[PDB]
Write a protein that binds this ligand. Sequence first.
Ligand SMILES: Nc1ncnc2c1ncn2[C@@H]1O[C@H](COP(=O)(O)OP(=O)(O)OP(=O)(O)O)[C@@H](O)[C@H]1O
Ligand SMILES: Nc1ncnc2c1ncn2[C@@H]1O[C@H](COP(=O)(O)OP(=O)(O)OP(=O)(O)O)[C@@H](O)[C@H]1O
Ligand SMILES: Nc1ncnc2c1ncn2[C@@H]1O[C@H](COP(=O)(O)OP(=O)(O)OP(=O)(O)O)[C@@H](O)[C@H]1O
Ligand SMILES: Nc1ncnc2c1ncn2[C@@H]1O[C@H](COP(=O)(O)OP(=O)(O)OP(=O)(O)O)[C@@H](O)[C@H]1O
Lengths: 520, 520
Amino acid sequence: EKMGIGGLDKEFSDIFRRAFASRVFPPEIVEQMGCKHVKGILLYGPPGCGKTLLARQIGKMLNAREPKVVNGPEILNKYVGESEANIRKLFADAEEEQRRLGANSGLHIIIFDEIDAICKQRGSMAGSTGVHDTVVNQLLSKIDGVEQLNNILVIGMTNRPDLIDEALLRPGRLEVKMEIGLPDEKGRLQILHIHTARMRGHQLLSADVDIKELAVETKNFSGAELEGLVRAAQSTAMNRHIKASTKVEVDMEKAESLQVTRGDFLASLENDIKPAFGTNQEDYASYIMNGIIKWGDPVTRVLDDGELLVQQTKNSDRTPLVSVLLEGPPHSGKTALAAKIAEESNFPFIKICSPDKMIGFSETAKCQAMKKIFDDAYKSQLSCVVVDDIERLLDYVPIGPRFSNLVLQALLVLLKKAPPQGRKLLIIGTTSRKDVLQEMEMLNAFSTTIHVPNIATGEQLLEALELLGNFKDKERTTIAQQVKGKKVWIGIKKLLMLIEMSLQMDPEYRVRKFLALLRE
Amino acid sequence: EKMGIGGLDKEFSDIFRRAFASRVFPPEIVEQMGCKHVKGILLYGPPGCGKTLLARQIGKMLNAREPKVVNGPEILNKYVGESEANIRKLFADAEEEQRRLGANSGLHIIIFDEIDAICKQRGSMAGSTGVHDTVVNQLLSKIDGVEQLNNILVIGMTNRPDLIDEALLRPGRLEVKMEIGLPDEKGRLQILHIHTARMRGHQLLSADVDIKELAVETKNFSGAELEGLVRAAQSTAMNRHIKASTKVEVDMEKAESLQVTRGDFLASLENDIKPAFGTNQEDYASYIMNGIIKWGDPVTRVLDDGELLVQQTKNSDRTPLVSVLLEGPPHSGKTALAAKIAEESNFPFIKICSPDKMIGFSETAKCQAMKKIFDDAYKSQLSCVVVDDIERLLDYVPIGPRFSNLVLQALLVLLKKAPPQGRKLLIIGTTSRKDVLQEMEMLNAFSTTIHVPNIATGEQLLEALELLGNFKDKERTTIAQQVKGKKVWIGIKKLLMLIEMSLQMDPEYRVRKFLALLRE
Ligand SMILES: Nc1ncnc2c1ncn2[C@@H]1O[C@H](COP(=O)(O)OP(=O)(O)OP(=O)(O)O)[C@@H](O)[C@H]1O
Ligand SMILES: Nc1ncnc2c1ncn2[C@@H]1O[C@H](COP(=O)(O)OP(=O)(O)OP(=O)(O)O)[C@@H](O)[C@H]1O
Ligand SMILES: Nc1ncnc2c1ncn2[C@@H]1O[C@H](COP(=O)(O)OP(=O)(O)OP(=O)(O)O)[C@@H](O)[C@H]1O
Ligand SMILES: Nc1ncnc2c1ncn2[C@@H]1O[C@H](COP(=O)(O)OP(=O)(O)OP(=O)(O)O)[C@@H](O)[C@H]1O
């Protein structure tokens, strides 16, 4: 078969049909009317998807018996002038079979590793001291002219793909460059089944651990991200019910091999493996501080228009990109309702583009950071992006109005830039100044808006205060004798200010302290 | 059972579960219930908390006997190109257990003493001739395929966490990114108990020396900030015993003994003024130069509404970020009331963000120095940052009113940026221009404001003049006749200008000058 590779069947059976496909079955047919074989394979990917696991395995499944593994910068560090000589001493042991042939999956491989250390010169003369180019075109020309080997396979990999030389990406040199992305929901029940297979115990981990329960809520992070989930829990199982009393002067195995329980894994994804991507815990709980109380009908009227528009994103093909805009008065709770819509949306990739992780950045350094978030939402099938607090990305201020034009015209594009075809993106935006964006025609950019009001009547003010539950029934009555019939207009976040400044007074005085602060 | 590390019972037992739960305990169930061992630990921190203590101690409680201790920029040494000769001879002796001794000991450690000067990988390779892009992935690919079980355990530590390359912190290479901060109240009677253990007259120093009483008032500053307390207290007790002007060594101990008193510790609390985290009157008395006299209820209404709002920060968990804005006319003693609210609050961390230390800074350097102050607040349990004199940080001037947009957008974010979970902050703002900060939408951002007024009546002027104690009782009688009838309006700082400008006249003309300058 192969050693365990999870969720890469549309790639490993795709470098079947470019490299593996020849060289075993058609040497009686290519000898009739064939052509040259493949030359080399490139491997895209964010770190953690399983690039290197292929070259450990395709260096062994090929039965080649000479895996000439090189590191990336392993060549460069010789004396100045003689740097380029190592790679031509690397092909030369293969190059003696210029005169021969063979059978059973042809047997010379060269494996680079993060190849964009050597293979720089994307077209911008990247580097100096005259070596950053000469080790490129030494390597450009050992696999084209003159012809050789017809039996090597330069399996390269990298993390930064589009910086390799474009003359080294043509099919004469590296035939197949291939996107190895993170596995989907179907791919993560493949890979959990692999790293919990040599585990036997009672039965293959335990009796209680459902890997399908660990498939769906471990919902986006990649391969070695997921290997660390198993490896941490069985390490917590090395401190649980057999070794929970190690007490650094250790015991031996006295309590005899506790199975890795279900409480191990959901403590390990609780603490401390962040998915580093970051999905299903980006700490959106910093934005939803005091929960989501349904203080009125205009809360339910907002978040149902979440799912009546989230399901527009999940089940369409006419509109691959839906961009909504939450608006309303300040302190009204828009960032929470942008997160609570996005968290209850159950998309894989939920990234809150909040400007607090961008403080002090210039007009360029925000656009280079917003580019990184929207490219991380282009690498997913289903993704949501909260572009939070529009008037702080645009560094806006109403004195003679100044703002960033450079961020604006790199945000008016990204509300109308389609993803790769077949991929869905939900953009949620929060703003407190609607009629500023009415000038800049960003209301024209969003698909539709959702007005988030303040608390409207005195019934909602009590209903916001019943659910928080801070005041006594007699103490609620005095406020009920004031605002019932009056006209209050104040946000929910500002209501959390006025409740909490009120409690720090005397216990008989916590009522009209709130009623003094409510007047403004 | 273990050599001294103070107050890191959680963090040191959390690398028990990572690089200490496997690899030693069962030690044959690991190969039965298959599992790779972890490849290293990452140590965050503010400077001086026991990051390098957790290399030297962890290199001696492993019984590993060969810590390959490298330094931070140690590797980079040779000519350009030649740098990676060190970071592949670094793993080379541990590579040589890829032998017939494949498993089974196992000689591990490599200590990156300051990793952030090696690993950046900024993704756009903005660096000439290969500075920080080929020492990174030579390192990224000598700890991956092809690999053994394997031998190594790479411990890297840094003052600056996030500037490390995000490709390297995957669960393959460096699993745990462990937070080593400043210790709490109970962690410090661990570390005072460690360094004063060998300190002895018999086993301890004296009787009046109690570390548990010095645990609670040396409250904020970290471990290396606290060993300097112990070392400079016995240093004070040297010169208490010996005499030192010349090379004189003459004792041959004069009391025939030596012990360190409690008065020798708190002599070195006038030095070591809780550096970089905390104050014990740490020379912010240059903002209160002439005291805070209470000339009426409009001072007591100011410094109690501060200390009520301090109770909101300390007790509450609904609103973990509380902000205030002391406002009023110029020369009204606003800065001095802000430091007095902070000094009467007994917070650990009281840093004053002030424009007087920022003279001549450009618009970028005002944001990053303001960002450095709040990031020190975010590394404490409690904190209170006095953002003083808003319209000088914003470098405001109202002729076609020009200001720094970038400072205002690095200030409207930080007044709402929440500290991490369980930590508090109290931002106190002073400004002279209520209306201009309304025009910038900043009075929106603060929770509440306190109008600090001028003295408005003749009675408050006479009461302010008694408490200073400048004039004479018959001379104040001349003042008491004149300042009544008409109502005056002047600040408290401007009042201190006029009194000193009036004392320097002739003594027969001090009073008839002070009543002349006060006409405007
Ligand atoms: N699809 C997969 N199936 C099984 N295991 C996987 C898969 N993807 C990743 N892994 C795990 O990831 C670990 C190493 O992956 P790899 O080194 O390829 O990450 P990478 O970032 O792609 O490589 P590099 O770090 O060299 O760039 C292996 O231990 C392997 O168990
Ligand atoms: N139904 C609700 N909708 C929104 N927020 C709520 C609700 N119920 C309670 N809250 C609390 O109110 C707070 C709202 O804070 P939030 O920053 O979202 O207000 P905001 O209007 O976005 O302020 P700003 O616009 O200045 O960022 C959250 O901490 C949340 O816990
Ligand atoms: N928890 C602790 N217990 C005992 N001593 C400590 C503790 N924390 C710090 N120290 C003291 O701090 C000193 C070194 O501190 P630390 O290891 O934090 O330096 P560092 O910040 O790691 O320096 P660098 O990062 O440059 O290596 C030692 O003298 C050690 O005794
Ligand atoms: N009751 C009081 N309140 C405030 N300040 C007082 C009081 N009594 C005396 N002072 C003195 O008044 C001085 C005012 O200092 P401060 O810098 O606060 O003035 P200010 O109003 O902030 O000036 P500016 O508005 O120009 O910054 C302080 O040195 C303080 O010692």
